[PDB]
Every structure is written in structure tokens, then in C-alpha cells.
Design a binder for this molecule. Sequence first.
Ligand code: HEM
Ligand code: HEM
Ligand code: HEM
Ligand code: HEM
Ligand SMILES: [Mg+2]
Ligand SMILES: [Mg+2]
Lengths: 306, 306, 304, 307, 306, 306
Amino acid sequence: EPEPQMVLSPLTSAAIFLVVTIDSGGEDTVRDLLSDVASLERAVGFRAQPDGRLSCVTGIGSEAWDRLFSGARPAGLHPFRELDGPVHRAVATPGDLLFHIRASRLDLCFALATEIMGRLRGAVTPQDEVHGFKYFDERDMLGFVAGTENPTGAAARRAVLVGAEDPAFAGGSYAVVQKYLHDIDAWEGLSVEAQERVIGRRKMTDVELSDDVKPADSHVALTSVTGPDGSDLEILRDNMPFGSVGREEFGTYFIGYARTPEVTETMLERMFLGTASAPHDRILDFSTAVTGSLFFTPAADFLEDL
Amino acid sequence: EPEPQMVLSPLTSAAIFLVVTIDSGGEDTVRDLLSDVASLERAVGFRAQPDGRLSCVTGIGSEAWDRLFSGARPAGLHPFRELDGPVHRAVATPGDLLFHIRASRLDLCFALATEIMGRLRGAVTPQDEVHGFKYFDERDMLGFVAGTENPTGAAARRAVLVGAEDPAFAGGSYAVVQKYLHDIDAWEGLSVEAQERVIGRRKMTDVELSDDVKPADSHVALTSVTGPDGSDLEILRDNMPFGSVGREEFGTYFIGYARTPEVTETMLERMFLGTASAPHDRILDFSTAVTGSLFFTPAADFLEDL
Amino acid sequence: PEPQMVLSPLTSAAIFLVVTIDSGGEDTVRDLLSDVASLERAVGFRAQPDGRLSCVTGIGSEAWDRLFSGARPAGLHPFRELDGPVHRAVATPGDLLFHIRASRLDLCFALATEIMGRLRGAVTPQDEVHGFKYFDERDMLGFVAGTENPTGAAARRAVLVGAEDPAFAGGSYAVVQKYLHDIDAWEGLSVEAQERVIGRRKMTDVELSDDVKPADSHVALTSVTGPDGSDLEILRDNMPFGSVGREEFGTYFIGYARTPEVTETMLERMFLGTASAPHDRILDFSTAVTGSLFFTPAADFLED
Amino acid sequence: EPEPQMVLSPLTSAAIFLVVTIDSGGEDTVRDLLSDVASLERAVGFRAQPDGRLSCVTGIGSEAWDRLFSGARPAGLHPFRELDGPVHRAVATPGDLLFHIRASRLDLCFALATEIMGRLRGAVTPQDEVHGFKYFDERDMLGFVAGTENPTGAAARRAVLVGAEDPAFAGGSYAVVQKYLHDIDAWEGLSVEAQERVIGRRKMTDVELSDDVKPADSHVALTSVTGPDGSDLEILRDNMPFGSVGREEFGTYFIGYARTPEVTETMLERMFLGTASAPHDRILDFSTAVTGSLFFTPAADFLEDLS
Amino acid sequence: EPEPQMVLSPLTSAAIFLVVTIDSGGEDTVRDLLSDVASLERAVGFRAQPDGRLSCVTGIGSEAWDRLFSGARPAGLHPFRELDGPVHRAVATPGDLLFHIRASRLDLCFALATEIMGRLRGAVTPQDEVHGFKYFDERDMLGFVAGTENPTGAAARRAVLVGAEDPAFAGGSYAVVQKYLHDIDAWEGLSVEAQERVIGRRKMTDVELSDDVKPADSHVALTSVTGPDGSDLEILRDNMPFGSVGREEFGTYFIGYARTPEVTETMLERMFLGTASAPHDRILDFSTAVTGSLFFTPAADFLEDL
Amino acid sequence: EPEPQMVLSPLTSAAIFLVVTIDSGGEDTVRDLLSDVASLERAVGFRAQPDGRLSCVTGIGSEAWDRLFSGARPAGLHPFRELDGPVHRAVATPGDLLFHIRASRLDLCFALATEIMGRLRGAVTPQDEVHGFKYFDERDMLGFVAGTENPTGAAARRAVLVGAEDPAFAGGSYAVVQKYLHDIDAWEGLSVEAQERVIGRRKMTDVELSDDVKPADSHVALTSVTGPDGSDLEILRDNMPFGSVGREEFGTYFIGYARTPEVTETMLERMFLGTASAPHDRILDFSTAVTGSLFFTPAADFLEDL
Ligand code: HEM
Ligand code: HEM
Ligand code: HEM
Ligand code: HEM
Ligand SMILES: [Mg+2]
Ligand SMILES: [Mg+2]
């Protein structure tokens, strides 16, 4: 049975997201680092266990894959597709490698980031670095609980991990990232009731709005998708607030894992392009995407063997 | 007894340092915020007690004092004094207000910073914003334990709080801040034993080097100061690592509190200008100061009674 | 099939809610059942990982026939009243059980509030108990409670319906009884006399050896062996409760099993006695004031 | 300095409030129990330290004081004064002894309540027993954070503990209790902004409303009181949710400690009788007081030195 | 105010008790270590704060005091007085220095013991070393709660710290130690009710037996002492279980702190020699003392000024 | 179907290792105790759950197996093989039963050890008893992190548990124990860099030395072993510091579990007897083995069915 990366992590209150491009000639250095990244994760994290909860999920973009590896490609790997909606746009931005670093403390994330980037200096150019922090009651930058309807247990494994449909890549996953900046002033001018109509859940109690009252352009309504057999299509999300008070930057860093990118891409199409009943996701009236990238996160043993 | 701000805080693993200047006409907005800052600290922090450990210490610079208040000035308040040493320089940079925000989690620091800056928008210009994180075993960016010889209990109160020498300002303190960037590549080229000779303490065990082995230009030797009667002159420090892996920025944010700025200024003169036996503090061969400011942190009731 | 959270980690707080379904309340009940897992997530998620909030939902025999058509679970029937020579196990009404557990009573209460909010006008409350465990896992009699519960695979095999009733695989059967204790009479016994009642040492929680353990001790009467000589096991999560002002000092008994026959055989031994034991000596200090049986379906049964 | 009881406790998530009356002839049994209550607190609590945080504050009503003790009375002790407002009433109900029992866990509260009541059986009649639990984010039954503006440290000592003004009773305090039941249906029919105008603070963030927006009949405006010199008069509160979902009982148990009952009584008068600018505290349109009692909580050494 | 050592510590679950004798010629090495012991405590303990709660109380015996120091001596300092009762004996055993090391974890105790003994190698001979552990519910090796009636707060300071009666030594205390081994087989032959009559408290609930049932030769009755003016004479105890299962050694390490040794010695006399109404403390029928030593624990600043 | 003992335990900060021999005639008493050991574990441990994490792993030696049981032997069970190297020796010492007791607190370990030894008095002779404690940062007595490269999850199950190759004993494991005493004086005379060359990892950061610099006689190089198919052969280790400061005993108690003893024995041979490129493991120049024994730890159901 192939060993996945730590895509299914315990709850963590801190994260670093690192997106880089691989410079010309940097391929060999990158391959060496990939074969050591799990041993660096253990080195940094083991002595802080059990409370540290340090993990690193490593992802590779479509164009980078062809530069690094010969043989088969993962079936669903392609560049992030830009969505040019009537009002809102989901931009595509460059990224060859993702490091999704999570722990209970930002310092542990930083120590691992420092070791990873130390080995890659001269081979990569940083595109994005975000230091994320979750609020103490699992709330996001909009004041709502984040993570409630994530799948757990076997339902999570089924939703996230590549299996028999792409057997050479079993135990992998696909990550989509988007960095969002919020208009906090406009958001906080809404009443709580109007915010609940945007999200589709109660703010304080986190109870879902009933079907008869939930707006068709609420976030929860548009990101609820049923498959060909009427089962729910699910993804696993670990959105993280970030910001700078001096620069008035108040953000949500979105990351979503799925067994195939088609699930995530269908959700994004509904959000940005809308449906028969909804012009677009009302969350986008307060949130602007400034990055967008797609990565394949291979099985841990795939990385170890190169 | 006047009530001090939370200068003597429990150990915290997260901090935000905010330094701002007061714009033309911003005085009244600032005074209103100062009279509310303790109540904002309670609002953000109380529901996360007892583990949150959220506090905010507010400081006011020399020039800002005269713009905000009439009547007496604190006796020791003056602008930061630039030190132009033979090799190393301690720069002065602008700052009218300091907010030293501490907690066990960065999100609580950020929430308070957001409320404070929300009330000040349009009245202040940000000069510096640093998000600090301490390593899980109380280590700093150089890999040494940080805080070991800080005073505690009654010795700390005596060292930090203004008393009968300046009775109108009893329960206040003086804060000096400097942001340092490290040359980590050069530091990590030293052996552990060579690093220990720079600091003056063992790296793994944090035991002080004996007087016969401790170099005269070690950090602990230069920052050890005796008064006219041979008593130790002490300050309270809460130095915090910070940085950005993508920008190769690895820093220490220095903050030191003392009952009179003369103690901290004597330490800085020994570090930057040296003594008969030491050209300068060897820590400065790996650390460059890029900011420097001095603030008076009044008793909490002084702020409240505006 | 995915079970409900019958096998929970240890919790220090609980709310037990038993209700009857009023005439015309069926539809409101069915709607709540299809939402109960989503309400559990909504209340519990923001207090993770320490909250450990869960809700196990059970349905009685008479209620089942009112709510659902098609197959019944094979073992579902009303609680059987036991009229012993001295002690009686009463049957009391109950159509739905909510067994709510967490590390803190406030989280239990928040979920109970949301559940009862959705059911108002459709149900009548029969019982509500707010349970608390003592800091050293002791019960109201001063003994450690839960020691011999099965764990891991043995727990799954003992508690979850399987291939013997395949349409209801992943379900379980819950028996509840509320007991009030005579604490004055109990505390008049020596520790050694109490140990002979229970069958375990009080301070150290070591089982009394076979040569000293009385036949009418609680542990001896609730030890039952199957056709192949294996132990028949149940999973228990007994909770203290009470009111100091009313001198009410209680144990809320709940036992889960794959078939109610195991639990019912234990109860018959306790209340009716055997050739070797008049009755369970624990019953000389404990009176049952409720008794109900529920089937707790697989979580996916409720969600559909 | 005389030693207070644990009036200023760390934050606790569980409480039991026990109010009893002393039966005729029960005085001697009561006095014996009072001289042992500290030792019972240690017996129950010590083996659960450091996490248990078990404490018991013992209070004695005005009429009970006269029955138990033959010497001088605390200067501010009198029976709770009923407030008969144009709309709302603060009832006075019987109570001779208060046991305010706090810990991190309800079982530790219950163990101590059991030991106390075991010694008093036959000498007292129970009037009220409430098992309180705090919501995990310090919220009350109305969904608002409770405790935010309580004084801390030296300001709390100065506000709560009797000093030089009544030297024989230094280290004591005065407790007012009221059990409130809420109309949760009516409350949940308000918008969040309408709730915020009732309380005087933002619901989600717990930031106080500006002076320009905060209504005169908000709870925070009516319970804000300044003294003869313009200093704030403060009390220490440890309000606790309680209830029963089956009976639709959703409550707040109010307890407030103060160095003199006059501060707490002034706040209650403003709430129930109103001011020039406010008919009454709007929180009372959603909250009914069903008990009301006043107690003196003596210094610990006063209790220990008894026959 | 003179600063005491950490005689009144928060609750700790681990301890090391180290008793040594000073070898001929070892005086100078010992004096140097004493002047450094608080700085060693900070070095070992700081990086495990706030939960470590590492402290070291240092005591000096009567004969050692006269070897190390000249001039005035603490008023009550003498060698432990052997008690030769009709049945039971309290032995005096050699000991010049006590290190009473406490923390929430044994490893912190061990690290500090290692540093202390490292500085003293060649100057001292070990007489006793005990590694103590508390049971999870504060119980001792007899199964009873230990520590319940210790004084707290102000009453503890008054009972333990030397004051105006010996002003040159204000802020000190006197420690008596005795290592006890228990005859667990004999003890476990009693019923619980018979055990309770030995101790004077209920076993499970730790409620004191009422005056009408408490025997005169119970442990709590013999260790309850009133002074000529009616006040309770109290000591502070931090008894620790210890043992070795293979050697069937089950013990209690007794340590009692008091402002004068007269209080502790009066308790010991009542235990071992008895009263008019009690032949001896019944706890001694199941407990044998194998060490006995007395130490003065000076104010912290006395040690620092060497 | 078979239920293993708790070989794969969560991390624990305390342990007791008890090794006994079975006296002539003690076999029946031992068999009775083995059938009850799981129920004693529950009795002691249940009331401290969920934080106690008390477990006991029971092992049986080769000669004891033949005295206790008839029918099949586990295929790999034999007495520990003495290794007589040119410089260093791995001695074989007597041991019939191992009790490897772990918990979050030493109290719980001690209570269970007391109950076990209580049942076996008169049937067994203690050979070794060690009370282990972890340093707060997972460090050993040499100052290095211990446990970093242990297998986890499925890789741990595959490495440790007997399966289809010995089907009657599926769910069992083999334990090798050695008690080591260190020469701490000689070790602390090395520079940190010289220590790192002994171990094969960086001291402070726990990063493995790269292949070009790692010495062939480093500990990590000699204990890295590849199988016939090029896979890494792994074991699960739960080494625990122990000691006595007064006797200058500073130790590491080695325990290693594996599905077959040949893996552990190949590592030992490389350490003690060396390779073409390394005379012996350099860790042995600072570490002396004073015990050595091998045990089979059966499935839990094997013990219960006695
Ligand atoms: C007043 C009610 C009760 C009290 C206070 C109580 C208490 C206890 C205690 C202290 C134990 C020993 C520790 C443990 O394993 O939990 C025990 C064991 C047990 N109890 Fe009860 N119990 C009660 C009622 C019941 C009822 C009604 C049943 C069955 C229908 C039951 C079945 C069991 C079983 C099966 C055991 C495990 C026996 C064994 O060691 O195999 N109990 N109970
Ligand atoms: C139904 C009963 C009550 C509820 C639900 C309630 C709730 C609250 C809330 C949510 C706050 C704001 C947060 C805080 O500082 O705790 C508050 C503040 C306060 N309450 Fe109440 N309360 C009640 C009864 C009372 C009573 C009866 C009194 C006085 C006799 C009182 C005195 C106060 C005071 C002095 C404050 C702080 C006001 C300020 O200075 O900011 N409360 N209460
Ligand atoms: C022999 C081993 C010892 C054991 C196992 C032991 C055990 C206990 C226990 C279980 C208690 C009751 C709970 C408490 O308040 O701590 C206690 C109380 C006490 N013990 Fe001991 N003890 C021992 C030796 C000593 C010695 C040698 C002294 C005095 C020299 C002493 C002085 C006290 C005192 C003063 C109390 C408090 C009595 C009261 O005022 O209530 N103990 N001890
Ligand atoms: C003096 C006794 C010992 C000490 C202080 C010691 C210490 C260590 C240290 C510090 C590590 C590096 C971090 C890690 O745990 O992975 C290590 C790794 C290891 N040790 Fe030891 N050890 C000792 C004895 C043994 C023995 C006797 C064996 C085998 C029989 C052994 C097998 C291993 C293995 C397999 C590894 C992992 C190597 C790798 O794949 O990276 N050790 N040891
Ligand atoms: Mg009978
Ligand atoms: Mg014996």
C-alpha cells in the first residue's frame, strides 16, 4: 500500500505556504531536496512531539513535472485554468513547487522552511510566502468558523487520495491554492444576518441555514456539488488567515485537496461563473484572488525513491 | 499604588511590535485611542483566558509627548541617541508610539493590532511592524536560550518601574527598541565553541562561562554593568525572532525595559563603543541594527484618565 | 457502514435525553434525524480537539413502527419489566434517546438545546439527566467505573450489528436505567463489605480472586459466557448525577451491545437471581426508576 | 492583614450555588460546620490540585447573623431590599447561608456540597440549588461574553474587601445573589444589532459601543456608576449559566461581591427603577429575577475561630 | 527585605534529595558552588519554563557551618538529636549539605543535580540520593493523601521563615529530613478502618476523624501541637514516595521546614517518646527511620554574597 | 485476527524495565500471572485515563519458554548471542521474563510493577530494575535527540510484528535489551563537531550529516542496513536515559523491537565486530553494555488463553 504525504493532518493553528519557481539548471538540486524532504520534516519536528504537530506537504506543478521526471504523468495534472467571469476573475500565477507547512506553532513552520530554502538557494525563485494563523475558536478573517464540513476518516481518504483510477500515482492528491485579499471595511458594514446570507451558516453557532432560507448565491450553496450518482463531491480544505495591519492586508489563503482537480475546478466555476440561479458566489464581493496554482502532491515513497 | 501596564508579563511565544508616527492633526484621535487601549485589550483577550495571555504595552516618544500632553515630562524622556562607533553604528529612526503586543498565539496579537490600527487610521503613519515568534525551547535566531538572566519578582519591579525619583510618573518605565538583522551564513560558519565565546554561555546547556574563560568582548561580559556601589544594574528584555525565508531576512527584535534609560544606554555604549579591554560586542559582527527608538510607557491609570 | 459514535473516548460530562413522540410529530422527528450529525459537527467543531462532543441517537420499538416502514432490526422490542422476588426493573416510556457526551457540560447543553429547539411541539420530555464523572473515574459508590469495558476489535465485535442482520449492520442496542442510591446505608458498610458487594478492591481496582469473590457480587453476576466459552461483553458508560438539596445521588446506566439478549441475560441474573445468588447485592443500595431499550442505527441510515 | 475567603478566585468553568435556611434549634450544628468549612474545602480539593481549583465562599444573611453571633454586626448587613419598579420587580427571597462553590469540574463542586450538607442535615432547609456551567468562550445564556470588565489585582481588592471603615470585619465582603430566567424565544427574535443595543457591547468581538451610539437604557450604561469624586464604583461578578432543556429553563445566576452593599444596591436601583433618561435596564425585558438575597462573607479567620 | 530560597514552592510531582559530606580540604570548592547555585538553577530551568517549576533549596549542617563560615551562627543550628524511645528510635546520620531539588519532571531535577555534583567532584562524598515521585492523587506509599493540612500563604511564611527573633539570619529556615522505609506487608494486613485509626483521617475522602473517634496515638493527634498562648505550631512538609520494587523497598522521604527546629523536634519527641496518653505514634509501627539530619537553609542573598 | 501487545506505544516520558529469572518450581505461579497481566494493566491504568497511557509489554526468554510451554516455539527465539569484538564486547546476561512498563508518569509504572512483583514473590529473582525518564526535548544522556528515525504507521507494523512467516505466533515481536553506561567525562571533552562525527547527525538541529561527510564508523552509518532487495531493514527503539548522580552512573537503556531478531543482531554485529571500513561503532568508545538479553513478546491473546 503506498504511503501518502500528511494531506490528512490534525488541526493546526499555524502554517507557512511557500511557492517557488525552478530556475534554469536548478532541476538536480530540486530532485535531491525532494528525496530528503521527509527526513528534514522528522529532523525539525521529532524533538517537539507530541504537541508540535509539524508536517510538510510537497506539491509539483504541471510544467515542472516534465522538467523533473520522465515516464508517466499523473492523469489530472495541468496548469490552473484562469476563470474570466462577468464580474469576478480567478487569476493563474506561476508556481513549480508548493511547500504546505503546518504545525501548532509558527516557529516550527519557520525552522522547516529555513532548512528547505537553505538547500534550494541558487536553484529556485520565491513567488509567494504566506505566514498563516488560525483564530483561537477556529474562526477565519471574516469571523466565521472554518473547516466545519471537511470530510473525516474514510470519507476523507476516498475524497482526497488517488486510487485505482491512476494506479502509478495512488496515494497522491491534487492541491489548488489561491491567495485572497478581503475588503474588511465593506464586510464589517454588513449586519450579522447579511453576512450569514453570504456564507450560508449562522455566525455565532455555526449551524447551517435551512434549505428554504439559504440563498442560492451563498458560498455553501454554490460549493455544494453532487456527482453523477447524486452523492456529494467533497474536498478537504485548510484555509488560513494572514495579514499585515500596517499595509491593511487582511487575507484568506485557500488550499483545497482532492483526488481529482475536476471537483475543485467545478466548485470554482460555480463561484466565478455562476449558475442558472446565481450570478456568482457572494463571498467574491468581499474577496479578490491574487494567486492561483495547481499542484500534484505525490505519495511519500515516490519522493523518497528519487 | 499607581497601576503599571503589563511590562512584567509571563513568558509569551508570540508578539507584534508596531511603531507609528503621528500625522499632522492626529493628536485628538490618538488621545481617544490611548484612553481606550486597556479596554480593547480586555475585549480581545478576556474570552481567550486563561491560555491567551494577551497584553499590550503602549509607549510614547519624546517629541510625541509634547504634542499630546501639557504639564510635567518624565525626567528621562529624550530622543534615542545615535552611537557612531569605530566599526558599528546604532541608528536612530522615527517613532512616536509603540505598541508591544504579546500573547501565546499570533492570532490574538493580530486581533488586538487590528482594533488599535482601526481606531488610528488617518491619524498615523506605520514605521515598523514585526511579527515575532519564539522557538519552542526558548531559543533565539542564533540558537541560544533567550531571557535566562532577566530579573524576577521584587528585583524586576525595582529594575523596571519608575518610583520616588520621579513621583508624578511612578509605575512607568522606559522602553528601547532596535530591530537587528543577522548574517546567519557567517554565524553558522562558526563552531559551537566559537559561538559560545561570542555570547558568553554554553549553547546546549545555557550555563554561563566562568569569569576566567568568558572573553572580555563577549555579549554577556559587555552587558554586565555595576553601579557606583557595586550593585548589578539590570534591565528586562523580551527579544523576539522574526523573518522571511524567501527574502533571507533573519532577525532579532530587541526590546529592553528599565526604570531609567541611562542603564540601557550604558549597555549600548559598551556594545557599540567598547571598553578599555574590548573594541565592541562580538555579537555585532553578526547583527546589524536597522531601527532605534526610545519610549516612555506610562502607568495604566495615566492613560485611562485622559 | 459508518456507525454512530457508540465507541467514544472517555468523557467527563453527559446529557441523557429521553422523549416520546406526540401524535402528529413524526415528520418533524424524521427531519431532525436527517440533520443530527450536521448539528453535532456545528456545535462541536469550534471546540476541537478537546471538546470530544458526540451524540448517539436511539429509537424505541413502538416509535420505529410509527416512523419507518419495511424491515425492523431483528432484536428491537420494548424493555422487558423484571419482577424479581425482592427487586424490580421497571419499564418506562421512551421513543427517542439522545446520548450526548463531551469534556464539558456546556457543549452537551448547547447541542441538547439545538436538538430540542427543532423538536418543540412534536415531542414530550420523559427524562433529562446531566451526568458528571469524578476526577478519578469513580462513581457515586466510590468505585472506579469502566475498568473492564472491551476496547479495539473486541469492542466492535461486542457492540456493532454485523452480517446476522445485514440491513442494520453498524447499528447497536442501548439499554438505559436510571438508578437512585441509598448512600446512608452504603456508607454504613465497611470498605471490605463494599468490596464483597462489587467484586473489586475499592482503592486499587483489582478484581477479587475467584476463591474470595462472592457469587452475588456485581462482577460475578454480570460475567456471562457464550456457547463456546468466550465472555459475552457489553460497553457501558455509567454516569453519576444528583441533587444535594433533594438527597438524590444516582447512577445513570447505559449499556451498548450487538444484541439485547446479552444485556437482558445480565439483568435477569441481577434482578431474578440464580441457583447460587438471590440477586445482585448492588441492588440492596440501588433502585431502578426508569428502563428503556433503543436501537441506535448506523449514521448513514439516519443521513438518508 | 486578616485572611479573606477566596472571593477573588481564578476563572472557573463550574459552580454550585447552595442557599439554605437555618431551622429552629439548628444554630449549634451550623456554628460547628462553619468552624470546619475551610478544612472540608482542603479535604475535598487538595488531592485534585493543581487543576481542580476548588474553593468555597461562605456567606451569612442578616437575620441568621443575629441568631448565630452575639457581638457586633458588619456595618452594611441587612436583608435584601425588594425593588418594586413601574414594570420590573426585584423580589427578596429567604436565605440564611450561602455556599458559593467553584472549581474546574462540576464533580468537585458536588463532592464538597455533599460533605457540607451531610454535616447540616436536620439543621437546615434547602431554598435553592443551582449547578452552573460556563460556555467554552466565556459566553452567557444570551450569547454575550460575561466577566470582561470585572476589576483585577489591586483594583479588585479595593472594590471587594472590607477595610478600615469597619475594622472588626476587615477582609470580609458582601454578596448579592439573584437567579434570573430568560425569555430566549423573545431574545432570539431580536436582530444581533438590537441585542447589542440592549447590552451595550458588540456580540461577536465584545468591544464596547461608542458613547455616541450606546443607549442610555443599555445594561452597561445603567450599571456604570461614578462616586462622589468621579471615580468608577466597581463590583466583582461571577455570573453563571444554568438550565434544563426539557423544561425550557435558560438562566443566569447572578452573584456580585462588593466592599459595601450600597454599590450593588445603587446598580440594582438604576436597573429596576430607572433614571431620568432610562425607564429601566432593557436586559430586564428578557430576564426575570426569581430570587434575591444578601450575605456577608466574613474573613476566613473569623469562621475558623468559632464555637 | 532579605530574599528567601524557594522553601514555599508550588506543588511538584518529582524531586531529588541529595545529602553529601564535605571532604577534608573541600571547603573552598563548596563555597564557590554555593555562590553559583541560584545561577545554575536558572540556567537549567529557564528553557523549560513556565511548566518546569525547577527549584533547589540548599541547606548547611551545624558542623559544616563551622568549617565554612566564621562569626555568628543561626541561633537554632545544631546536629540532629537522636531519639531513643522505648520501642522506636530516630537515628542521626551524617550530612553536611542538602540539595532539595523539585520540578514537574524528574529530568529537570537530574540535570540540575548533575551540574551541582559536577562542580563538587573531589570535594564531597555522597551520603544519600533519593528520586521522589508523587502518586497521581497526592497519595503516599501507605495510600493516604499527603500534604492536606500544610499551611498556605501568610500562615506558611510565618511558620517557616526566620524573622526578628534571629535578625542576622532573617529569611532562612530549618529543614529536618528523615528517610523512612515502610513495612507494606504488615500495613496491608490492617483493615481500612484500622489504617484510618493509625493516621487519624479517612483513607478515600481525606476527611479528618472527629475528636470523639480520633485515637490519642494517631499520627494527626501526636503531630498537632499548640503553643503556650493557644496558637497552632505548624511546619511545612513536602514528603515524597520513593522505592525499588525488586528490593521490596517502599519509602517516604520526609522533609519538614520550620522557623525554629524546636517545633519539628517537639513533634518528633511526641512521635518517638510519646505523651501521657500515647506510648508512641502508631505510624512508627509500620515505618522505620534510616536517616536523620538537620540543616539551615539561608536566605538566597546570603549564598550569593559568598 | 490476533491482538498484539502495546509494542507500538504513543511516546512516553517514564518507563520501568524489570528483568527477572524464574526460580526452580516457580513456573505455575508465573503462568497464572501471565494470564492476568492485561487485567492488572487495566486495573492500575484505567482510573488515570486518558492521559496516563500505561502499558506493559511482557516478554519471555528462550530457556524460560521451554520450562513454561509445550508445543511450538517461535521460530526466531534463542538466547542472546554474546559478541566478542577485538575491542568491545556485547555480554549475554540471564533473563527469563521482561516487563517493559511505560506511562506518562513514573507513579503509574511503579504501581503496576508493584502489583506484578507482588504476585510473583517467591517464584522469581530480580536481575535488573531500571527507572527511565525522558529529557524534555527527547534527548538522551549524550545530548542527542533519540527516536528520530523510528518507523511510524504501517511501516512500523511491518517492521515489528510477526506475520504469515510464523503463523502460530502472528502478532508477536522480538525484544533485545542492553543496559549501557556512558563515560560522560570523555564524551564532554569532545567538541560538538567531534560528537556529531560519532553519531552521524547534527547535535542541536538533529539533521543527518550528508553522505559525503558522514564517517563510516558513525553510529547512524553502522545501524543503517539494507536487505536482499535493497529495502531498508528497520527496528523500533524506545531507548530511555537513567542514572544516579552520586554513583556517577549515566546510562541509556536500549530496547529494540523487530519482527525477527536477525535484523537487530545484524546491527549489533556491525557495531561490535565492525565492517571492512569501520573497526567498530564509535559510540562504543563512550558506552559500555552491562546486560544483554533477548525475549519473545507474544500476542496479547496468547497470554490471556493460558
Ligand atoms: C447501580 C447501577 C450500577 C453501578 C453503580 C455499577 C458499577 C459498576 C462497577 C464499579 C463495576 C466494576 C468496574 C467496571 O468494569 O466498570 C461494574 C462492572 C460491570 N457492570 Fe455495573 N454498575 C451498575 C449497573 C449495571 C447494570 C444494570 C449492568 C448490566 C445490565 C451492569 C453490567 C456491568 C458489567 C458487564 C460489568 C463488567 C463485569 C466484568 O468484570 O466482567 N452494571 N459496574
Ligand atoms: C440577567 C442578568 C444579567 C446578565 C445576563 C448580565 C450580562 C452582562 C454582560 C453580558 C455584561 C458585559 C460583559 C461584562 O463586563 O461582564 C455585563 C456587564 C455588567 N453587569 Fe451584568 N448581567 C446581568 C445582571 C446584572 C446585575 C443584576 C448587575 C448589578 C446588580 C450587573 C452588573 C453589571 C456590571 C457592573 C457590569 C459591567 C458594566 C461596565 O462597567 O462595563 N449585572 N453584564
Ligand atoms: C513516617 C512517614 C510519614 C508519613 C507516611 C506521614 C503521613 C502523613 C499523612 C498521611 C498526613 C495527613 C495529611 C496531611 O496533612 O499531610 C500527615 C500529617 C502530618 N504529618 Fe506526617 N507523615 C510522616 C512523618 C512525619 C513526621 C516525621 C512529622 C513531624 C516531625 C510529621 C508531621 C505531620 C504533621 C504536622 C501533619 C499535620 C497534622 C495536622 O495538623 O493535621 N509527619 N502525615
Ligand atoms: C549506547 C547506546 C545507544 C545510544 C546513546 C544510541 C543513540 C542513538 C541516536 C542519538 C540516534 C540518532 C537519532 C535516532 O534515534 O534515530 C540513533 C539511531 C539509531 N540507533 Fe542507536 N543508540 C544506542 C544503541 C543502539 C543499539 C544497541 C542499536 C541496534 C541494535 C541501535 C540502533 C539504532 C538505529 C537502527 C538507529 C536509526 C539509524 C538510522 O536509520 O537513521 N542503537 N541511536
Ligand atoms: Mg436482603
Ligand atoms: Mg515485606
